[PDB]
Design an enzyme around this catalytic site. Structure first.
Site, PDB file in Angstrom:
ATOM      1  N   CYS A 120       0.796  -1.231   0.000  1.00 16.11           N
ATOM      2  CA  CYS A 120       0.000   0.000   0.000  1.00 16.11           C
ATOM      3  C   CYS A 120       0.830   1.282   0.000  1.00 16.11           C
ATOM      4  O   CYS A 120       0.364   2.325  -0.439  1.00 16.11           O
ATOM      5  CB  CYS A 120      -0.991   0.024   1.182  1.00 16.11           C
ATOM      6  SG  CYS A 120      -0.284   0.199   2.870  1.00 16.11           S
ATOM      7  N   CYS A 173      -1.622   3.923   0.866  1.00 10.38           N
ATOM      8  CA  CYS A 173      -1.431   4.386   2.237  1.00 10.38           C
ATOM      9  C   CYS A 173      -0.074   5.112   2.294  1.00 10.38           C
ATOM     10  O   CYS A 173       0.696   5.004   1.354  1.00 10.38           O
ATOM     11  CB  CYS A 173      -1.439   3.200   3.177  1.00 10.38           C
ATOM     12  SG  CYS A 173       0.101   2.256   3.099  1.00 10.38           S
TER      13      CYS A 173
END
Ligand SMILES: O=c1c2ncn3c2ncn1[C@@H]1O[C@H](COP(=O)(O)OP(=O)(O)OCC2O[C@@H]3[C@H](O)C2O)[C@@H](O)[C@H]1O
Length: 252
Positions: A75, A157
């Site tokens: 991520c 992320c």
């Protein structure tokens, strides 16, 4: 045959064989996708658009495909791009520093392909397909990219990177997939920073394009989402790629 139905190019020749082959190749190479049944993937992909009006496609049409194509991507290593796909791809290929959409099973299956069907016939239309602008935006290819691009953004992320084409009139383009879908689907709870790399096309000697009005716009939009923004100029992408391949280099 002197006038096609739609204004866009028709389905890529051998589309079914091409997609199935791509799925086989990807799943052979990438061990976490090793189990995927490629006939099932093709069936789901077909199911999205066969026997459907090619101006009436929805994200729902693609959910069986999205399910079969479910894949974990690190991520914190996601690379987004706008109008500069080749450099993005050349960069990730050196040592997998980052991952683009095209590095995922689904991006890989569809990259550079065109497809559409016909309402009330199960035939693939190899003659023409809807153009997003002239015909309709809810067409098989556009709806696919919108759906997968959204999901890719949602997966991100930490620090997310974006390569932007600094030779364009709008370096950041609000109407692009990056600007209209991805910037709005980064999850502020998860994403700390969006870092933009502005890639110069003005060959050698050039300005600080991180001061471009459209970059200031991007900064504003993302800042107001509670995500930090960072920007860097890549003045010479040829040197950049060389430094990625050999950072033990004097010029770097
Ligand atoms: O990965 C693709 C992709 N592969 C192929 N294509 C993609 N589009 C978006 N994406 C995703 O959105 C952006 C790029 O789309 P864009 O901003 O419209 O650039 P762009 O305008 O260069 O992308 C043009 C483009 O090329 C096709 C698709 O048909 C489409 O809209 C990337 O961050 C990707 O994650």
């Amino acid at each position: 045959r002197w006038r096609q139905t739609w204004s866009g190019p028709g389905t890529t020749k051998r589309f079914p064989e091409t997609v199935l082959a791509r799925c086989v190749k990807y799943t052979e190479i990438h061990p976490e996708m090793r189990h995927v049944d490629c006939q099932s993937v093709w069936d789901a992909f077909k199911g999205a658009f066969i026997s459907k009006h090619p101006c009436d496609i929805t994200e729902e049409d693609y959910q069986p495909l999205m399910k079969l194509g479910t894949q974990t991507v690190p991520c914190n290593k996601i690379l987004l791009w706008s109008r500069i796909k080749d450099l993005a791809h050349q960069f990730t290929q050196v040592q997998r520093d980052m991952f683009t959409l095209e590095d995922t099973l689904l991006g890989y299956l569809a990259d550079d392909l065109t497809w559409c069907g016909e309402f009330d016939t199960s035939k693939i239309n190899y003659q023409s397909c809807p153009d997003w602008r002239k015909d309709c935006s809810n067409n098989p290819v556009s709806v696919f990219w919108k759906t997968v691009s959204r999901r890719f953004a949602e997966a991100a992320c930490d620090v997310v990177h974006v390569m932007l084409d600094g030779s364009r009139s709008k370096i950041f383009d609000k109407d692009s997939t990056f600007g209209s879908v991805q910037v709005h689907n980064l999850q502020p709870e998860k994403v700390q920073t969006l870092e933009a790399w502005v890639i110069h096309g003005g060959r050698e000697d050039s300005r600080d394009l991180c001061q471009d009005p459209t970059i200031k716009e991007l900064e504003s939009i993302i800042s107001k989402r509670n995500i930090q923004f960072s920007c860097k100029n890549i003045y010479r992408p040829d040197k950049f790629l060389q430094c990625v391949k050999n950072p033990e280099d004097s010029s770097c």
